[PDB]
Amino acid sequence: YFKIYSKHTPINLVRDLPQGFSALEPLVDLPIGINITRFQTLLALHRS
Amino acid sequence: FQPTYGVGYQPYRVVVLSFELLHAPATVCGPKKSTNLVKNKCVNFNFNG
Numbered sequence: 001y002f003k004i005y006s007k008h009t010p011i012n013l014v015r016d017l018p019q020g021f022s023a024l025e026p027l028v029d030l031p032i033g034i035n036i037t038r039f040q041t042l043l044a045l046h047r048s
Numbered sequence: 049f050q051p052t053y054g055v056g057y058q059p060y061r062v063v064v065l066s067f068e069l070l071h072a073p074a075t076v077c078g079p080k081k082s083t084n085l086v087k088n089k090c091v092n093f094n095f096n097g
């Protein structure tokens with residue numbers, strides 16, 4: 001089972017993580033049934 | 049294929065459904081039915097397992 005929990009939080013701090021409490025709601029459970037040992041973030045370029 | 053053929057030569061559309069169980073979580077389930085909810089009585093309830 002692949003559990004994805006998520007939370008959206010409105011913050012106004014400039015640099016670091018804000019200090020506070022926010023419990024993450026369960027968003028979606030995925031029936032994947034596969035081995036995962038590595039991950040990589042996906043970003044977006046800005047072209048001009 | 050022609051429409052005037054015998055029953056042993058007429059075209060037959062065949063669909064073969066193959067059901068396998070793998071170690072991944074099984075997700076193609078049948079439609080479980082829903083017995084009409086009864087309130088205010090001592091009943092045996094089964095809600096989502």
Ligand SMILES: *[C@@H]1O[C@H](CO)[C@@H](O)[C@H](O)[C@H]1NC(C)=O
Pocket residue numbers: 035036037
């Ligand atoms: C999952 O992948 C890792 C790294 O490839 C491997 O060491 C491990 O044995 C794998 N586990 C299964 C159950 O395939």
